[PDB]
Amino acid sequence: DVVVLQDSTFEQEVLKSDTPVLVDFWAVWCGPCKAIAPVVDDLAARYKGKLKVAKMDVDQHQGVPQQYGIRSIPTLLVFKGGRVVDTVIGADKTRLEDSVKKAIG
């Protein structure tokens, strides 16, 4: 259910998506990322028709995280029509749910 992104595939997968997209910026060393990851998976399953869920290992792919000003992780971006709907900084479960809802609404 969760798409693995690369710098080369980000435009196509995320920016040109027809549905809203949740992008989880994460790394293998990031403990709070593991706290938010099951919520991300759960949203992927819960909104399977209506939401694309994707993740980006900021150590594997540094170009795009840098263009979006991703300073710390976890950071999660909700996209729609190529634009950023919200930026969720940290494992903020509530804010993540709410921002997804706004996008889909």
Automatic annotation (TrEMBL):
From the UniProt record, list the coiled-coil ranges.
Answer: none
Q: Where is this site: Contributes to redox potential value?
A: 31-32
What are the positions of the active site?
30 (nucleophile), 33 (nucleophile)
In this chain, the site described as Deprotonates C-terminal active site Cys is at 24
Name the Pfam families for this protein.
Thioredoxin (PF00085)
Known Gene3D superfamilies for this protein? Glutaredoxin (3.40.30.10)
Q: Which UniProt keywords apply?
A: Disulfide bond, Electron transport, Redox-active center, Transport
Highest taxon of source? Bacteria
> According to the UniProt record, which cysteines are disulfide-bonded?
30-33, 30-33
NCBIfam families per UniProt: thioredoxin
Q: What's the protein called, per UniProt?
A: Thioredoxin
Please report the organism this UniProt entry assigns to the protein: Anaeromyxobacter dehalogenans (strain 2CP-C)
